[PDB]
Write a protein that binds this ligand. Structure first.
Ligand SMILES: CC(=O)N[C@@H](Cc1ccccc1Cl)C(=O)N1CCC[C@]12C=C[C@@H]1CC[C@@H](C(=O)N3CC[C@@H]4C=C[C@H]5C=C[C@@H](C(=O)O)N5C(=O)[C@H]43)N1C2=O
Ligand SMILES: [Br-]
Ligand SMILES: [Br-]
Length: 110
């Protein structure tokens, strides 16, 4: 089965490569509950975020082994895939540190 190993509150953003700016994931700005989930068997992790107001899934992306997770500032962290760059604007330094730590520890289990 699948298990949430950590969660944190963050405004989830994606980078608009064409206009050089960050835009809100899913179309509207606001905080989401962002989880890292582990699936047993094939030992995979994914980031899944749902907007707190309406449960819209704003991010659902795989965490591949060797993913480069960038702590750009104390409360904005980011990573990429082929299609998009994702950014989490955390509610506090503490939320960020919790999430970052779970991510770094996931990358060691992969
Ligand atoms: C090599 C590479 O991919 N580099 C990436 C970052 C990264 C490094 C390691 C691993 C993964 C990633 Cl995504 C990179 O530099 N990127 C990807 C998106 C666009 C950007 C490339 C150039 C620009 C320059 C400034 C920086 C950026 O986007 N920043 C810096 C921190 C700041 C913090 C928050 C967001 C929120 C709104 C916007 C703003 O402040 O107006 N922000 C920014 O402007 C953010 N940029 C980036 O982060
Ligand atoms: Br829970
Ligand atoms: Br496993």
């Amino acid at each position: 089965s699948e298990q949430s190993i950590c969660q944190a509150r963050a405004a989830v953003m994606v980078y608009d490569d064409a206009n050089k700016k960050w835009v809100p994931a899913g179309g509207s700005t606001g905080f989401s509950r962002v989880h890292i989930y582990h699936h047993t068997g094939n030992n995979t992790f994914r980031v899944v975020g749902r907007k707190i107001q309406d449960h819209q899934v704003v991010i659902n992306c795989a965490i591949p082994k060797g993913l480069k997770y960038n702590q750009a500032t104390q409360t904005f962290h980011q990573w990429r895939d082929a299609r998009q760059v994702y950014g989490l604007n955390f509610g506090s330094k503490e939320d960020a540190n919790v999430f970052a730590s779970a991510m770094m520890h996931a990358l060691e289990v992969l």
